[PDB]
Amino acid sequence: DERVIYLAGGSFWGLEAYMERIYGVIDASSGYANGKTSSTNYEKLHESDHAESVKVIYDPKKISLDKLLRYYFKVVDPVSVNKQGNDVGRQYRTGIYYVNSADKEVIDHALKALQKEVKGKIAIEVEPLKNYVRAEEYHQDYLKKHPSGYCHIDLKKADEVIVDDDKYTKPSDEVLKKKLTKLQYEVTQNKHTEKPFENEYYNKEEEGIYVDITTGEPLFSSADKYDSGCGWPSFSKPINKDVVKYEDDESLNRKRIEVLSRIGKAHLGHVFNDGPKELGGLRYSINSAALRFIPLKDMEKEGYGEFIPYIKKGELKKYINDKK
């Protein structure tokens, strides 16, 4: 069925508009949560002690509560008390309010993970929803009605891909010796480089996703692939900012930047600053031997269905940008 979670994260105008853009969110509405009364209004907030919140109805088949929270973490200061941006006050406190007992454990785990990486003392409170009142219809869909309205957060973050670092694992070195070809092993494990113009993917122009051949972790979208003329698969950026790592490479009497996968720590290739201007200028020059391409039609079967709308939206954007 459909599930609900209530999120207080400062300005509810931008928050509501943000959550609405997340894939899996059926509806987002503005409101007032966990105050001292059973009903209030926008200029009785300071007395009712309600927090400006967003009621988020989501499809648990399409997005989990855990990933939904991690989208929410991207647009709030998790350590500040009663303040987000320039909005000061108790109605701007951060909080997560649940109506299902089983949601408490998920929320608590997500906050500890968030804390374990951004550090500090997480100020986000966690309580069951006690009393709630839907905001005035003047406040509903506010940024749709006022495209120049106040919005402190970056709504583009809602289009970013989140890749779970715990659903892909690197098999043992002994398993990789049987699962990978000789070439794939040397490239990914010993930093060799396959031959340019003689590898499977450098000239592939097909919609889908490229994953770490050693772990299955998503790495690159077909929407960011382009023809570099260099003979290796070339991308303008990874599928998000978390899946690849960067390291100095001083071999071959050159100085270069090696790119590696986050989970598998596999050698992928290198990143250069000679990519096409209109795509950002970077060239991620990746070995086919480090990648496994999964076409759009196959992504659901292979366990990557939650990334399909992201590949397709990327390919629509590439399609339109071509039309200039």
Author numbering: 34 to 357
Direct quotes from the study:
Methionine sulfoxide reductase (Msr) is a family of enzymes that reduces oxidized methionine and plays an important role in the survival of bacteria under oxidative stress conditions. MsrA is stereospecific for reducing L-methionine S-sulfoxide, whereas MsrB is stereospecific for the reduction of the R diastereomer. MsrA and MsrB exist in a fusion protein form (MsrAB) in some pathogenic bacteria, such as Helicobacter pylori (Hp), Streptococcus pneumoniae, and Treponema denticola.
The crystal structure of HpMsrABC44S/C318S was solved at 2.2 Å and belonged to the P1 space group. Each monomer of HpMsrABC44S/C318S had two catalytic domains, HpMsrA (34–192, residue number) and HpMsrB (206–357), which were linked by the linker region, iloop (193–205). To understand the fused form instead of the separated enzyme at the molecular level, we determined the crystal structure of HpMsrABC44S/C318S at 2.2 Å, which showed that a linker region (Hpiloop, 193–205) between two domains interacted with each HpMsrA or HpMsrB domain via three salt bridges (E193-K107, D197-R103, and K200-D339). Even though we co-crystallized an HpMsrAB mutant (C44S/C318S) protein with the substrate analog compound, dabsyl-Met-(R,S)-O, no analog compounds were found in the active sites of HpMsrA or HpMsrB. In the active site of the HpMsrA domain, the carboxyl group of the acetate ion interacted with Oδ1 of E85 (2.50 Å), OH of Y75 (2.60 Å), OH of Y125 (2.79 Å), and Oδ of S44 (2.93 Å). The interaction residues were as follows: the carboxyl group of the acetate ion interacted with Nε of H303 (2.69 Å), one water molecule (W4, 2.70 Å), and Oδ of C318S (2.67 Å). Therefore, both the active sites of HpMsrAB were reduced.
